[PDB]
Ligand binder design. Structure first.
Ligand SMILES: CC(C)S(=O)(=O)NC[C@@H](C)c1ccc(-n2cc(CO)c(C(F)(F)F)n2)cc1
Ligand SMILES: N[C@@H](CCC(=O)O)C(=O)O
Ligand SMILES: N[C@@H](CCC(=O)O)C(=O)O
Lengths: 263, 263
């Protein structure tokens, strides 16, 4: 039919979407800033639609409950028609690509290790061969699923430890996992996406480090309900923005230019 | 209808598709080896189709002639229905994504600089600020198009030089550009994709080097004619292979394990 204001689902995750400090003075899309706030503005311009940013109610990326088969998070908001598009650091996975459409990826990432500086760990293999330092992942996301499914020996060894560890090694939010690394005196390491890991390393108090190579190679995509009319224009817009240098400019804006830990 | 043997278009490009040395003893798909030979076998298995590898007649990736609007290369083979699928290091671009379907990317790359070891160049900026050392790209591909379209100052400066340079800085095949770097005593630098650059650096005579960071961020996709029934199963297969670790294993097989220049 006639063009309608598009409901965008997204998630509070630095530096993608962040509440402006004075947000209670502000209304609508003006409450928020970040890489995905900027990317939403670009996508909507290039597709000629009006839109409203909404933070996912349950604060989750998206996983399907094994008993109910109900999708939660941003994936769930698309699946049940509560949002028209998800513009967020939402990982392209086979289990999701089957229930939602994903654009070509707008950013690459791989799973990585965050340590408190000085922690005697340089790799996933190192983590797996010891017990002094606990380690975990975010709940309700692609990292946790990577470990759960992995048939690779070292990651399977890691998963077997993590699923049964006490107290729990899993966290609800990235901020929580970061707080735990910062406050555990080197006795907790966090497995999170390289992109997030990199942003945090350049933020005060400058007490974390990314170590080792990435565990996998993947991407974030703009997601739409399966068969949405938005899917095609959205994908073309991501490719156009890539080719125009805009994605690179936005990455520099929200990563390099936001660096607080020196050169 | 009933399932038919799929015609695969591909291109002789190391280490993706390479003639086996004894190929005149061999027939059909057995003539060829490489990353994309292996990837084709995996894709066809996961999609349950039989297939025939064919080398693109004109030896080109795909560009559209500005006067005729006729597509050449592997893109042209898809557009005119001479091939059912292209399984090759074929770059996802907006001009192509509009005439063919691309899978989610199976490998990432960026444009990069190849020099003869000892060449006093470390970046694109360095190349642009001098004239002693000539530099160019492959014809009929995404690298040449990147420079031609770029609105970025340094790349526009590079393009202005390259388009008018004499003798021509452009080459028909990657092997030709590599030969020119090797035989020009440091007076020619070649702009090519990081993936290819990396493979060549680890091959005898070990006389080239990749320098500087990548100029862009993009990917190779499996391409199909627009609206092909193969598009969906092919994409799911790429995601499944990614998640299974197969793409990483194949990268190690054809890059790291093929290294001839030491550690
Ligand atoms: C035209 C650009 C917008 S594009 O689409 O290339 N995307 C732009 C860039 C940043 C990108 C490239 C490849 C990937 N990627 C995803 C996967 C797995 O899905 C893999 C691999 F190869 F490691 F398996 N790479 C993710 C992101
Ligand atoms: N980007 C991930 C969330 C972060 C993580 O799982 O580490 C997802 O889409 O589920
Ligand atoms: N992968 C490129 C060819 C190599 C290049 O242009 O450097 C393409 O699809 O056109």
């Amino acid at each position: 039919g006639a063009n309608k204001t598009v409901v965008v689902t997204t998630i509070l995750e630095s530096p993608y979407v962040m509440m402006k400090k004075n947000h209670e003075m502000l209304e609508g899309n003006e409450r928020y800033e970040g890489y995905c706030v900027d990317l939403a503005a670009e996508i909507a311009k290039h597709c000629g639609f009006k839109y409203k940013l909404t933070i996912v109610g349950d604060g989750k990326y998206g996983a399907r409950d094994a008993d109910t088969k109900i999708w939660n998070g941003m994936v769930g908001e698309l699946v049940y028609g509560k949002a028209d598009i998800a513009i967020a650091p939402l990982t392209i996975t086979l289990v999701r690509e089957e229930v939602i459409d994903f654009s070509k990826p707008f950013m690459s990432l791989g799973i990585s290790i965050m340590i408190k500086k000085g922690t005697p760990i340089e790799s996933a293999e190192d983590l797996s061969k010891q017990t002094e330092i606990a380690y975990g992942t975010l709940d309700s996301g692609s990292t946790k699923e990577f470990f759960r499914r992995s048939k690779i020996a070292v990651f399977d060894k890691m998963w077997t430890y993590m699923r049964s560890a006490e107290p729990s090694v899993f966290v609800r939010t990235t901020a929580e996992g970061v707080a735990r690394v910062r406050k555990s005196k080197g006795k907790y390491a966090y497995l999170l996406e390289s992109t997030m890991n990199e942003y945090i390393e350049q933020r005060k108090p400058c007490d974390t480090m990314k170590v080792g190579g990435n565990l996998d190679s993947k991407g974030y995509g703009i997601a739409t309900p399966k068969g949405s009319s938005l899917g095609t224009p959205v994908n073309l817009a991501v490719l156009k923005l890539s080719e125009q240098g805009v994605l690179d400019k936005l990455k520099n804006k929200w990563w390099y230019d936001k660096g607080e830990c020196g050169a």
